Coordinates of C-alpha atoms in Angstrom, one line a residue:
Chain A
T205 CA 218.0 -44.7 -144.6
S206 CA 216.8 -47.7 -142.6
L207 CA 213.8 -48.0 -145.0
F208 CA 213.7 -51.0 -147.2
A209 CA 213.5 -50.4 -150.9
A210 CA 210.5 -48.6 -152.4
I211 CA 207.9 -51.4 -153.2
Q212 CA 204.7 -51.9 -155.2
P213 CA 202.0 -54.3 -154.1
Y214 CA 201.7 -57.8 -155.5
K215 CA 197.9 -57.7 -155.1
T216 CA 195.2 -55.1 -154.6
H217 CA 191.6 -55.6 -153.4
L218 CA 188.3 -53.9 -153.0
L219 CA 186.4 -55.2 -150.0
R220 CA 182.8 -54.2 -149.3
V221 CA 182.3 -53.8 -145.6
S222 CA 178.9 -52.1 -145.5
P223 CA 176.2 -51.3 -148.0
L224 CA 178.0 -48.0 -148.3
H225 CA 181.7 -48.4 -147.6
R226 CA 184.3 -50.2 -149.6
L227 CA 187.9 -50.6 -148.6
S228 CA 190.9 -50.5 -150.9
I229 CA 193.5 -53.1 -149.6
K230 CA 197.0 -53.6 -150.9
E231 CA 199.4 -56.4 -150.1
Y232 CA 203.2 -56.0 -150.3
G233 CA 206.2 -58.2 -149.8
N234 CA 206.1 -62.0 -149.1
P235 CA 202.7 -63.7 -149.4
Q236 CA 204.3 -66.4 -147.2
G237 CA 205.6 -64.0 -144.6
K238 CA 204.4 -63.0 -141.2
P239 CA 201.1 -61.0 -141.5
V240 CA 201.2 -57.4 -140.4
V241 CA 198.5 -54.7 -140.8
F242 CA 199.3 -51.1 -141.2
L243 CA 196.9 -48.5 -139.7
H244 CA 197.3 -45.1 -141.3
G245 CA 196.7 -41.9 -139.3
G246 CA 194.5 -38.9 -139.6
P247 CA 191.9 -40.3 -139.2
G248 CA 191.2 -40.0 -143.0
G249 CA 194.7 -39.7 -144.2
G250 CA 194.9 -42.9 -146.2
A251 CA 197.9 -45.2 -146.6
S252 CA 200.6 -45.0 -149.3
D253 CA 203.1 -47.4 -150.9
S254 CA 205.9 -45.8 -148.9
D255 CA 204.3 -47.0 -145.6
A256 CA 205.2 -50.5 -146.8
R257 CA 208.8 -49.6 -146.5
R258 CA 209.1 -50.1 -142.8
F259 CA 208.7 -53.9 -143.1
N260 CA 211.2 -56.4 -144.4
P261 CA 209.7 -57.6 -147.7
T262 CA 211.2 -61.0 -147.3
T263 CA 210.0 -61.5 -143.8
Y264 CA 206.5 -59.9 -143.7
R265 CA 203.2 -60.2 -145.5
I266 CA 202.5 -56.5 -145.5
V267 CA 198.8 -55.5 -145.5
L268 CA 197.9 -51.9 -146.1
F269 CA 194.5 -50.5 -146.5
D270 CA 192.7 -47.2 -146.5
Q271 CA 190.1 -46.7 -143.7
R272 CA 186.5 -45.6 -144.6
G273 CA 186.3 -42.5 -146.7
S274 CA 190.1 -42.1 -147.1
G275 CA 192.6 -42.8 -149.8
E276 CA 191.2 -45.0 -152.6
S277 CA 188.4 -46.4 -150.4
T278 CA 184.9 -45.4 -151.4
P279 CA 182.9 -43.3 -151.0
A280 CA 185.5 -40.6 -150.7
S281 CA 185.1 -38.2 -147.7
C282 CA 181.9 -40.1 -146.6
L283 CA 181.0 -39.4 -142.9
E284 CA 178.1 -41.7 -142.8
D285 CA 178.7 -44.7 -140.6
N286 CA 182.3 -43.7 -140.1
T287 CA 183.1 -44.5 -136.5
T288 CA 185.9 -46.1 -134.4
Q289 CA 183.8 -49.2 -133.8
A290 CA 183.2 -49.6 -137.5
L291 CA 186.9 -49.2 -138.3
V292 CA 187.7 -51.7 -135.6
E293 CA 185.3 -54.2 -137.1
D294 CA 186.7 -53.5 -140.6
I295 CA 190.2 -54.6 -139.5
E296 CA 188.6 -58.0 -138.5
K297 CA 186.7 -58.2 -141.9
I298 CA 190.0 -57.7 -143.7
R299 CA 191.9 -60.2 -141.5
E300 CA 189.4 -63.0 -142.4
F301 CA 189.0 -62.0 -146.1
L302 CA 192.7 -62.1 -146.7
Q303 CA 192.8 -65.4 -144.8
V304 CA 195.9 -64.2 -143.0
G305 CA 195.2 -66.6 -140.2
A306 CA 194.2 -66.2 -136.6
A307 CA 196.5 -63.3 -135.6
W308 CA 198.8 -60.6 -137.0
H309 CA 201.2 -57.8 -136.1
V310 CA 199.7 -54.4 -135.9
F311 CA 201.5 -51.1 -136.8
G312 CA 200.1 -47.6 -136.2
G313 CA 201.1 -44.0 -135.5
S314 CA 199.1 -41.0 -134.4
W315 CA 195.4 -41.8 -135.2
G316 CA 196.9 -45.2 -136.2
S317 CA 198.0 -45.8 -132.6
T318 CA 194.5 -44.8 -131.5
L319 CA 193.0 -47.4 -133.8
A320 CA 195.7 -50.0 -132.9
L321 CA 194.9 -49.6 -129.2
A322 CA 191.1 -49.7 -129.8
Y323 CA 191.6 -52.8 -132.0
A324 CA 193.9 -54.6 -129.6
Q325 CA 191.6 -53.9 -126.7
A326 CA 188.6 -55.3 -128.6
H327 CA 190.4 -58.3 -130.0
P328 CA 193.6 -58.9 -128.0
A329 CA 193.9 -62.5 -129.2
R330 CA 194.2 -61.2 -132.8
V331 CA 197.3 -59.1 -132.1
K332 CA 200.9 -60.6 -132.2
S333 CA 202.6 -57.3 -131.5
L334 CA 202.0 -53.5 -131.3
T335 CA 204.4 -51.0 -132.9
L336 CA 203.1 -47.6 -131.8
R337 CA 204.2 -44.0 -132.5
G338 CA 203.0 -40.5 -131.6
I339 CA 200.4 -41.8 -129.1
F340 CA 197.0 -40.2 -129.5
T341 CA 193.9 -41.2 -127.5
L342 CA 191.6 -38.3 -128.4
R343 CA 191.1 -37.1 -124.8
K344 CA 189.7 -33.6 -124.6
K345 CA 192.9 -32.0 -123.3
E346 CA 194.8 -33.7 -126.2
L347 CA 192.5 -32.2 -128.8
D348 CA 192.2 -28.9 -127.0
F349 CA 196.0 -28.6 -126.8
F350 CA 196.3 -28.8 -130.6
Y351 CA 193.1 -27.4 -132.0
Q352 CA 191.8 -25.0 -129.3
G353 CA 194.8 -23.5 -127.4
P354 CA 196.8 -22.6 -125.5
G355 CA 199.2 -25.4 -126.6
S356 CA 201.0 -26.0 -129.8
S357 CA 199.7 -22.5 -130.7
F358 CA 202.5 -21.1 -128.6
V359 CA 205.3 -22.9 -130.5
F360 CA 203.9 -22.2 -134.0
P361 CA 202.2 -18.9 -133.6
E362 CA 202.5 -17.9 -137.3
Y363 CA 200.7 -21.0 -138.4
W364 CA 198.2 -20.7 -135.5
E365 CA 197.2 -17.3 -136.9
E366 CA 196.5 -18.8 -140.3
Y367 CA 194.4 -21.6 -138.6
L368 CA 192.3 -19.1 -136.6
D369 CA 191.6 -17.0 -139.7
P370 CA 188.6 -18.7 -141.4
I371 CA 186.7 -18.7 -138.0
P372 CA 184.7 -15.6 -136.8
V373 CA 186.1 -14.6 -133.4
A374 CA 182.7 -15.2 -131.7
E375 CA 183.0 -18.9 -132.7
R376 CA 186.6 -19.3 -131.7
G377 CA 185.5 -20.8 -128.4
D378 CA 185.2 -24.2 -130.0
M379 CA 187.5 -24.5 -133.0
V380 CA 186.7 -28.1 -133.8
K381 CA 183.0 -27.5 -133.9
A382 CA 183.4 -24.3 -135.9
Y383 CA 185.5 -26.2 -138.4
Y384 CA 183.3 -29.3 -138.6
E385 CA 180.3 -27.2 -139.4
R386 CA 182.0 -25.6 -142.3
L387 CA 183.6 -28.8 -143.4
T388 CA 180.1 -30.4 -143.6
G389 CA 178.2 -27.2 -144.7
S390 CA 176.6 -26.7 -148.1
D391 CA 178.8 -23.8 -149.2
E392 CA 181.6 -25.5 -151.2
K393 CA 184.1 -22.7 -151.2
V394 CA 184.1 -22.4 -147.4
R395 CA 184.3 -26.2 -147.1
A396 CA 187.4 -26.2 -149.4
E397 CA 188.9 -23.2 -147.7
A398 CA 188.4 -24.8 -144.3
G399 CA 189.8 -28.1 -145.4
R400 CA 193.0 -26.5 -146.6
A401 CA 193.5 -24.4 -143.5
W402 CA 192.7 -27.3 -141.1
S403 CA 195.1 -29.6 -143.0
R404 CA 197.8 -27.0 -143.3
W405 CA 197.9 -26.4 -139.5
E406 CA 198.8 -30.1 -139.0
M407 CA 201.2 -30.3 -141.9
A408 CA 203.1 -27.2 -140.7
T409 CA 203.4 -28.6 -137.1
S410 CA 204.3 -32.2 -137.9
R411 CA 208.1 -32.2 -138.0
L412 CA 211.0 -30.5 -136.0
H413 CA 211.9 -28.5 -139.0
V414 CA 209.0 -27.1 -141.0
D415 CA 208.9 -29.1 -144.3
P416 CA 207.4 -27.3 -147.3
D417 CA 206.7 -30.7 -149.0
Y418 CA 204.5 -31.6 -146.0
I419 CA 202.8 -28.2 -146.2
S420 CA 201.9 -28.4 -149.9
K421 CA 199.8 -31.5 -149.2
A422 CA 197.1 -29.3 -147.8
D423 CA 196.9 -27.6 -151.2
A424 CA 195.7 -30.9 -152.7
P425 CA 191.9 -30.6 -152.4
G426 CA 191.4 -34.3 -152.9
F427 CA 193.5 -35.1 -149.8
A428 CA 192.6 -32.0 -147.8
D429 CA 188.8 -32.5 -148.0
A430 CA 188.7 -36.1 -146.7
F431 CA 191.5 -35.5 -144.3
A432 CA 189.9 -32.5 -142.6
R433 CA 186.3 -33.8 -142.7
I434 CA 187.1 -37.2 -141.2
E435 CA 189.5 -35.7 -138.6
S436 CA 187.0 -33.1 -137.5
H437 CA 184.2 -35.7 -137.6
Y438 CA 186.1 -38.0 -135.1
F439 CA 187.5 -35.2 -133.0
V440 CA 184.2 -33.4 -132.5
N441 CA 182.8 -36.8 -131.4
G442 CA 185.6 -37.7 -129.1
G443 CA 186.5 -40.6 -131.3
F444 CA 183.2 -42.1 -130.3
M445 CA 184.6 -43.3 -127.0
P446 CA 184.1 -42.1 -123.4
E447 CA 186.7 -39.6 -122.2
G448 CA 190.0 -41.5 -121.6
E449 CA 188.6 -44.8 -122.6
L450 CA 191.8 -46.2 -124.0
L451 CA 193.8 -45.3 -120.9
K452 CA 191.4 -46.9 -118.4
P453 CA 193.3 -49.6 -116.4
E454 CA 190.7 -52.3 -117.1
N455 CA 191.3 -51.8 -120.8
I456 CA 195.1 -51.5 -120.6
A457 CA 195.0 -54.9 -118.8
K458 CA 193.5 -56.5 -121.9
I459 CA 196.6 -55.7 -123.9
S460 CA 199.3 -55.6 -121.2
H461 CA 200.8 -58.9 -122.3
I462 CA 201.0 -57.9 -126.0
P463 CA 204.6 -57.3 -127.1
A464 CA 204.8 -53.6 -127.7
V465 CA 207.0 -50.6 -128.5
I466 CA 206.0 -47.0 -128.1
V467 CA 208.2 -44.6 -130.2
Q468 CA 207.6 -41.0 -129.3
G469 CA 209.1 -37.7 -130.5
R470 CA 210.0 -35.4 -127.6
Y471 CA 208.9 -32.3 -129.6
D472 CA 205.8 -33.9 -131.1
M473 CA 203.5 -30.8 -131.3
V474 CA 200.5 -32.7 -132.8
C475 CA 200.3 -35.5 -130.2
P476 CA 202.5 -34.3 -127.2
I477 CA 204.6 -36.8 -125.3
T478 CA 202.4 -36.6 -122.1
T479 CA 199.9 -39.0 -123.5
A480 CA 202.6 -41.6 -124.5
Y481 CA 204.3 -41.1 -121.1
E482 CA 201.0 -41.6 -119.3
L483 CA 200.5 -44.8 -121.3
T484 CA 203.9 -46.1 -120.3
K485 CA 203.0 -45.6 -116.6
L486 CA 199.9 -47.7 -117.1
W487 CA 201.8 -50.2 -119.3
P488 CA 205.3 -50.6 -118.1
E489 CA 205.6 -54.0 -120.0
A490 CA 205.8 -51.8 -123.1
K491 CA 209.1 -50.7 -124.5
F492 CA 209.4 -46.9 -124.4
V493 CA 211.6 -45.1 -127.0
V494 CA 211.8 -41.3 -126.8
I495 CA 213.4 -39.5 -129.7
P496 CA 215.0 -36.3 -128.3
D497 CA 215.0 -34.2 -131.6
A498 CA 211.9 -35.5 -133.4
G499 CA 208.5 -33.9 -133.8
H500 CA 205.3 -35.9 -134.7
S501 CA 206.0 -37.5 -138.0
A502 CA 207.1 -41.1 -138.6
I503 CA 209.8 -39.9 -141.0
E504 CA 211.7 -38.0 -138.4
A505 CA 215.2 -39.5 -138.6
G506 CA 215.3 -41.1 -135.2
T507 CA 211.6 -42.1 -135.1
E508 CA 211.9 -43.9 -138.5
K509 CA 215.1 -45.8 -137.4
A510 CA 213.5 -47.0 -134.2
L511 CA 210.3 -48.0 -136.1
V512 CA 212.2 -50.3 -138.4
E513 CA 214.1 -51.7 -135.5
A514 CA 210.7 -52.6 -134.0
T515 CA 209.4 -54.4 -137.0
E516 CA 212.7 -56.2 -137.4
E517 CA 212.7 -57.4 -133.8
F518 CA 208.9 -58.2 -133.8
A519 CA 209.5 -60.5 -136.8
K520 CA 211.2 -62.9 -134.4
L521 CA 207.9 -63.5 -132.7
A522 CA 206.7 -67.1 -133.5
Chain B
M41 CA 234.2 -25.4 -131.9
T42 CA 232.6 -22.3 -130.6
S43 CA 231.8 -18.6 -131.4
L44 CA 232.5 -17.7 -127.8
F45 CA 235.5 -15.6 -127.1
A46 CA 238.1 -16.9 -124.6
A47 CA 237.2 -17.5 -121.0
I48 CA 237.9 -14.3 -119.2
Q49 CA 238.3 -12.9 -115.7
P50 CA 237.3 -9.4 -114.7
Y51 CA 239.9 -6.6 -114.5
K52 CA 238.0 -4.8 -111.7
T53 CA 235.1 -5.9 -109.3
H54 CA 232.9 -3.5 -107.3
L55 CA 230.3 -3.4 -104.5
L56 CA 227.8 -0.7 -105.0
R57 CA 225.2 0.2 -102.4
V58 CA 221.9 1.0 -104.0
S59 CA 219.6 1.1 -101.1
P60 CA 219.9 0.9 -97.3
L61 CA 219.5 -2.8 -97.7
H62 CA 220.8 -3.9 -101.1
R63 CA 224.3 -4.0 -102.4
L64 CA 225.2 -5.0 -106.0
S65 CA 228.3 -6.9 -107.0
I66 CA 229.6 -5.5 -110.4
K67 CA 232.3 -7.0 -112.5
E68 CA 234.1 -5.4 -115.5
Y69 CA 235.7 -7.4 -118.2
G70 CA 237.6 -6.7 -121.4
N71 CA 238.8 -3.3 -122.6
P72 CA 238.3 -0.4 -120.2
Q73 CA 238.5 1.8 -123.2
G74 CA 236.0 -0.2 -125.2
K75 CA 232.3 0.4 -126.0
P76 CA 230.3 0.0 -122.8
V77 CA 227.8 -2.8 -122.6
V78 CA 225.7 -4.0 -119.7
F79 CA 224.7 -7.6 -119.3
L80 CA 221.4 -8.4 -117.6
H81 CA 221.2 -12.0 -116.3
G82 CA 218.0 -13.9 -116.3
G83 CA 215.8 -15.6 -113.7
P84 CA 215.0 -13.2 -112.1
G85 CA 217.5 -14.1 -109.3
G86 CA 219.9 -16.2 -111.4
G87 CA 222.9 -14.0 -111.1
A88 CA 225.6 -13.5 -113.7
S89 CA 228.8 -15.5 -114.2
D90 CA 232.2 -15.0 -115.8
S91 CA 231.1 -17.1 -118.8
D92 CA 228.5 -14.5 -119.7
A93 CA 231.3 -12.1 -120.5
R94 CA 232.3 -14.5 -123.4
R95 CA 229.7 -13.2 -125.8
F96 CA 231.5 -9.9 -126.3
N97 CA 234.8 -9.1 -128.0
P98 CA 237.2 -8.3 -125.2
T99 CA 239.2 -5.9 -127.4
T100 CA 236.1 -4.0 -128.6
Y101 CA 233.8 -4.0 -125.5
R102 CA 233.9 -2.6 -122.0
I103 CA 231.9 -5.5 -120.6
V104 CA 229.9 -4.7 -117.5
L105 CA 228.3 -7.6 -115.6
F106 CA 226.4 -7.3 -112.3
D107 CA 224.1 -9.5 -110.1
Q108 CA 220.6 -8.0 -109.6
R109 CA 219.3 -7.6 -106.1
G110 CA 219.5 -10.7 -103.9
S111 CA 221.2 -12.8 -106.6
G112 CA 224.7 -14.0 -107.2
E113 CA 227.2 -12.2 -105.0
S114 CA 224.9 -9.2 -104.4
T115 CA 223.8 -8.9 -100.8
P116 CA 221.7 -9.6 -99.0
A117 CA 221.3 -13.1 -100.6
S118 CA 217.7 -14.1 -101.4
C119 CA 216.3 -10.8 -99.9
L120 CA 212.8 -10.1 -101.3
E121 CA 212.5 -6.8 -99.5
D122 CA 212.3 -3.9 -102.0
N123 CA 213.1 -6.3 -104.9
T124 CA 211.0 -5.0 -107.8
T125 CA 211.3 -4.3 -111.5
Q126 CA 211.3 -0.6 -111.0
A127 CA 214.1 -0.9 -108.4
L128 CA 216.2 -3.0 -110.8
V129 CA 215.6 -0.6 -113.6
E130 CA 216.8 2.3 -111.4
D131 CA 219.8 0.1 -110.3
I132 CA 221.1 -0.1 -113.9
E133 CA 221.1 3.6 -114.0
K134 CA 223.0 3.8 -110.7
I135 CA 225.6 1.5 -112.1
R136 CA 225.9 3.4 -115.4
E137 CA 226.8 6.7 -113.6
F138 CA 228.9 5.0 -110.9
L139 CA 231.1 3.3 -113.5
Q140 CA 231.2 6.6 -115.4
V141 CA 230.5 4.6 -118.6
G142 CA 229.1 7.7 -120.3
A143 CA 225.7 8.8 -121.5
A144 CA 224.7 5.5 -123.1
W145 CA 225.6 1.9 -123.5
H146 CA 224.6 -1.3 -125.3
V147 CA 222.3 -3.7 -123.4
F148 CA 222.2 -7.5 -123.6
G149 CA 219.6 -9.7 -122.0
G150 CA 217.8 -13.1 -122.4
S151 CA 214.7 -14.4 -120.7
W152 CA 214.1 -12.3 -117.6
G153 CA 217.0 -10.4 -118.9
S154 CA 215.0 -9.4 -122.0
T155 CA 212.2 -8.4 -119.6
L156 CA 214.6 -6.1 -117.7
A157 CA 216.1 -4.9 -121.0
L158 CA 212.8 -3.9 -122.4
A159 CA 211.7 -2.2 -119.1
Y160 CA 215.0 -0.4 -118.9
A161 CA 214.9 0.8 -122.5
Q162 CA 211.3 1.9 -122.3
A163 CA 212.2 3.9 -119.1
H164 CA 215.5 5.3 -120.4
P165 CA 215.5 5.0 -124.2
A166 CA 218.2 7.7 -124.5
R167 CA 220.6 5.5 -122.4
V168 CA 220.5 2.5 -124.8
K169 CA 222.7 2.2 -127.9
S170 CA 221.4 -1.2 -128.9
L171 CA 219.4 -4.2 -127.7
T172 CA 220.4 -7.8 -128.1
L173 CA 217.4 -9.9 -126.8
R174 CA 216.9 -13.7 -126.5
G175 CA 214.1 -15.9 -125.3
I176 CA 211.6 -13.0 -125.0
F177 CA 209.7 -13.0 -121.7
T178 CA 207.2 -10.3 -120.7
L179 CA 205.6 -11.9 -117.7
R180 CA 202.0 -11.9 -119.1
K181 CA 199.6 -14.2 -117.3
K182 CA 199.4 -16.6 -120.2
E183 CA 203.2 -16.8 -120.4
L184 CA 203.5 -17.7 -116.7
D185 CA 200.5 -20.0 -116.8
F186 CA 201.9 -21.9 -119.8
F187 CA 205.0 -22.8 -117.9
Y188 CA 204.1 -22.9 -114.2
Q189 CA 200.4 -23.7 -114.3
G190 CA 199.5 -25.8 -117.3
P191 CA 198.5 -27.0 -119.8
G192 CA 201.6 -25.9 -121.7
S193 CA 205.2 -27.1 -121.3
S194 CA 203.7 -29.7 -119.1
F195 CA 202.7 -31.7 -122.2
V196 CA 206.2 -31.8 -123.7
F197 CA 208.0 -32.6 -120.4
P198 CA 205.5 -34.7 -118.5
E199 CA 208.0 -36.6 -116.4
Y200 CA 209.5 -33.4 -115.0
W201 CA 206.0 -31.8 -114.7
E202 CA 205.1 -34.6 -112.3
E203 CA 208.2 -33.9 -110.1
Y204 CA 207.2 -30.2 -110.2
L205 CA 203.6 -30.9 -109.1
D206 CA 204.7 -33.2 -106.3
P207 CA 205.4 -30.8 -103.4
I208 CA 202.0 -29.1 -103.8
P209 CA 198.9 -30.7 -102.3
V210 CA 196.3 -31.2 -105.0
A211 CA 193.8 -28.8 -103.5
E212 CA 196.4 -26.0 -103.9
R213 CA 197.3 -26.9 -107.4
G214 CA 194.9 -24.3 -108.8
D215 CA 197.6 -21.7 -108.5
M216 CA 201.1 -23.3 -108.6
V217 CA 203.0 -20.0 -108.4
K218 CA 201.2 -18.8 -105.2
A219 CA 201.5 -22.3 -103.7
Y220 CA 205.3 -22.3 -104.4
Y221 CA 205.8 -18.7 -103.3
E222 CA 204.2 -19.3 -99.9
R223 CA 206.4 -22.3 -99.3
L224 CA 209.5 -20.4 -100.6
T225 CA 208.7 -17.6 -98.1
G226 CA 207.4 -19.8 -95.3
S227 CA 209.0 -20.4 -91.9
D228 CA 209.6 -24.1 -92.3
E229 CA 213.1 -24.4 -93.7
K230 CA 213.0 -27.9 -95.1
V231 CA 209.8 -27.2 -97.1
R232 CA 211.4 -24.0 -98.4
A233 CA 214.6 -25.9 -99.5
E234 CA 212.5 -28.7 -101.0
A235 CA 210.4 -26.2 -102.9
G236 CA 213.4 -24.2 -104.1
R237 CA 215.0 -27.4 -105.6
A238 CA 211.8 -28.6 -107.3
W239 CA 210.9 -25.2 -108.7
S240 CA 214.5 -24.7 -110.0
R241 CA 214.7 -28.3 -111.4
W242 CA 211.6 -27.8 -113.5
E243 CA 213.2 -24.9 -115.3
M244 CA 216.7 -26.5 -115.6
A245 CA 215.1 -29.7 -117.1
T246 CA 213.1 -27.8 -119.7
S247 CA 215.7 -25.2 -120.8
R248 CA 217.4 -26.9 -123.8
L249 CA 216.4 -29.1 -126.7
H250 CA 218.3 -32.0 -125.2
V251 CA 217.9 -32.5 -121.5
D252 CA 221.3 -31.6 -120.0
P253 CA 222.2 -33.3 -116.7
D254 CA 224.7 -30.5 -116.0
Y255 CA 221.9 -28.0 -116.1
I256 CA 219.7 -30.1 -113.9
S257 CA 222.3 -30.6 -111.1
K258 CA 222.3 -26.8 -110.6
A259 CA 218.9 -27.1 -108.8
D260 CA 220.7 -29.4 -106.3
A261 CA 222.8 -26.4 -105.2
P262 CA 220.8 -24.9 -102.3
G263 CA 222.7 -21.6 -102.5
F264 CA 221.6 -21.0 -106.1
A265 CA 218.2 -22.8 -105.8
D266 CA 216.9 -20.8 -102.8
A267 CA 217.5 -17.3 -104.3
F268 CA 216.6 -18.4 -107.9
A269 CA 213.3 -19.8 -106.8
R270 CA 212.4 -17.2 -104.2
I271 CA 213.1 -14.2 -106.6
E272 CA 211.4 -15.9 -109.6
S273 CA 208.3 -16.7 -107.6
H274 CA 208.4 -13.3 -106.0
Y275 CA 208.2 -11.5 -109.4
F276 CA 206.0 -14.0 -111.1
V277 CA 203.3 -13.9 -108.3
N278 CA 203.4 -10.1 -108.6
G279 CA 203.2 -10.0 -112.4
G280 CA 206.7 -8.5 -112.6
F281 CA 205.1 -5.5 -110.8
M282 CA 203.7 -4.2 -114.1
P283 CA 200.2 -4.1 -115.5
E284 CA 199.3 -7.1 -117.7
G285 CA 201.0 -6.8 -121.1
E286 CA 202.7 -3.5 -120.2
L287 CA 205.9 -4.1 -122.2
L288 CA 203.9 -5.0 -125.3
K289 CA 201.6 -1.9 -125.3
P290 CA 202.1 0.1 -128.5
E291 CA 202.8 3.4 -126.7
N292 CA 205.7 1.7 -124.9
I293 CA 207.0 -0.2 -128.0
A294 CA 207.1 3.3 -129.7
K295 CA 209.6 4.5 -127.1
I296 CA 212.2 2.0 -128.2
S297 CA 211.3 1.4 -131.9
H298 CA 214.3 3.3 -133.1
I299 CA 216.8 1.4 -131.0
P300 CA 218.9 -1.0 -133.1
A301 CA 217.8 -4.5 -132.0
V302 CA 218.0 -8.2 -132.5
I303 CA 215.6 -10.8 -131.2
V304 CA 217.1 -14.3 -131.1
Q305 CA 214.5 -16.9 -130.4
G306 CA 214.6 -20.7 -130.1
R307 CA 211.7 -22.3 -131.9
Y308 CA 211.3 -25.0 -129.2
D309 CA 211.8 -22.7 -126.3
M310 CA 209.6 -24.3 -123.6
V311 CA 210.3 -21.8 -120.9
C312 CA 209.5 -18.7 -122.9
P313 CA 207.6 -19.9 -126.0
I314 CA 208.1 -18.2 -129.3
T315 CA 204.6 -16.6 -129.4
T316 CA 205.8 -13.8 -127.2
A317 CA 208.9 -13.0 -129.3
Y318 CA 206.7 -13.3 -132.5
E319 CA 204.1 -10.9 -131.1
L320 CA 206.9 -8.4 -130.2
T321 CA 208.2 -8.6 -133.8
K322 CA 204.8 -7.7 -135.1
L323 CA 204.7 -4.6 -132.9
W324 CA 208.4 -3.9 -133.6
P325 CA 209.2 -4.8 -137.2
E326 CA 212.3 -2.5 -137.1
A327 CA 213.9 -5.2 -134.9
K328 CA 215.8 -8.0 -136.5
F329 CA 214.2 -11.4 -135.9
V330 CA 216.3 -14.6 -135.8
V331 CA 214.5 -17.9 -135.1
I332 CA 216.7 -20.9 -134.3
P333 CA 214.8 -24.0 -135.6
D334 CA 216.4 -26.6 -133.3
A335 CA 217.0 -24.6 -130.1
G336 CA 215.2 -24.5 -126.8
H337 CA 215.4 -21.7 -124.3
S338 CA 219.0 -21.5 -123.3
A339 CA 221.5 -19.0 -124.6
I340 CA 224.1 -21.8 -125.0
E341 CA 222.0 -23.7 -127.6
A342 CA 224.4 -23.9 -130.6
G343 CA 222.4 -21.7 -133.0
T344 CA 221.3 -19.2 -130.4
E345 CA 224.8 -18.7 -129.1
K346 CA 226.2 -18.2 -132.6
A347 CA 223.5 -15.6 -133.5
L348 CA 224.1 -13.8 -130.2
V349 CA 227.8 -13.3 -130.9
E350 CA 227.0 -12.1 -134.4
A351 CA 224.7 -9.5 -132.8
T352 CA 227.4 -8.2 -130.4
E353 CA 230.0 -8.2 -133.2
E354 CA 227.7 -6.2 -135.5
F355 CA 226.5 -3.8 -132.7
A356 CA 230.1 -3.0 -132.0
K357 CA 230.1 -1.0 -135.2
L358 CA 227.6 1.5 -133.8
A359 CA 229.3 4.8 -133.2

């Protein structure tokens, strides 16, 4: 493995960011190292100790946190005031609170790359580098390809069937809305059932080979409820941005000078390579790394290796 | 390191007239005394090659290869006149009798070849000893739209998708297949050549898990590319000359449900995605399903090929 040793944090924090929300923040590695912030995906997936393993513990001050309503951040599964703009501002609140300094490296995959791009475009001076994987910009066609069909539905038809099951046929015209309404409804069984099914779909389609250890995560109600509720919340709302906002030239120009690597699995069936590719066209300064036998996940062998190579190289930035 | 039998040349070649127009090149390999098997190449319009004979034990099988109308060495090259599914189906029968193979034979086909295999078996189930099928393709609208129209494979191979869109003015992009067909059958020769290359390239680029430059260069062969694209577009724009979903109708699946069969399907087949194969297995549970987790479309994907030879080896036990 190209992963550094398993590692526990040297400090944990609880930072209030609104009268409602409270973010769990965990610092790993060298307190004197180069500051880097990890943005977990989902949205609503939360971070874990293992995500700290992609950064050299001697070189980096590694900052992990769980975005609103996810992981250990409170209140769990809370959809009130849980928007892209809020999350973007939260990263800034964390940056100052931890006194990391003026700028830091940023690391994100999937929804994490969405937040990274939104953050960098809103505060390009705060970003030393961008290590991006499984590019996701929440465009309609992106979400339709995965949640609506036809799309990934054709490559994983057996799981697609499972995913369609909780939704009456008449409502199948908008899967995300149909799920969101159940995930936010008053009936608890359906909300749990919908959380599991929604989550399972993604777990089952996240790697080249179907991983039963990935799939069983949907059977954890704690994870599945927040994961599904927050995902469906953002997705049904277009990530609270105009269509294609992140890919507009005027916005790409704000971050075109920021040292960057895009690492993308060729067979990513959650966030297909067309989005990443399109980004590379708008942003040729960025380094493009396609993994020919990897799906979506960061732990695909080739993706992981390239990711660590990115953090290693970016540590040379002054 | 391969499950392929040795490279092999035919012991006899034939030219069989099947219409006033068409004339099929037929090539026999292996043991004249062996169990008869007919290989149906894909495309449609791709033609067969000597290498396709390598999936059958040369001691055990009488291996019959032929190029379907207008493809390969069959004449006239790239001819779209009287080139339909029904005609191809009847051709297989004309070959069967002509070669005096006997009452029945094994059938082997992938992609368009599985389409022809299914059509053939449904029309003459008594003539089929077994069915070895790969990359299932039944020419449904959603199948053709997923690959040629988008969104679909377009999302996984965006750089090649762009190349494929390029020859077509954007106002015509609403129906890619018709826009291609009209160019592929137009009077302007450059456009026709250009369209043949681009259409063919798209498929070559998307046919294996790893992009194979040796596959891709085949589109740069105008001889191949012109017939390949013309015939593909011809059938596709015509729905394979069958009602929507004809092959998958229960009453038709019932005609072949008893026929020993194996479906071998690549999980990441981006030309003929696994949903079709999967749906077939639901209608046809008697059939043996083999999914290859790291294979795309092509028969030569490592796992697909291995499973294919295992199928011919096992089916050779059939009395």
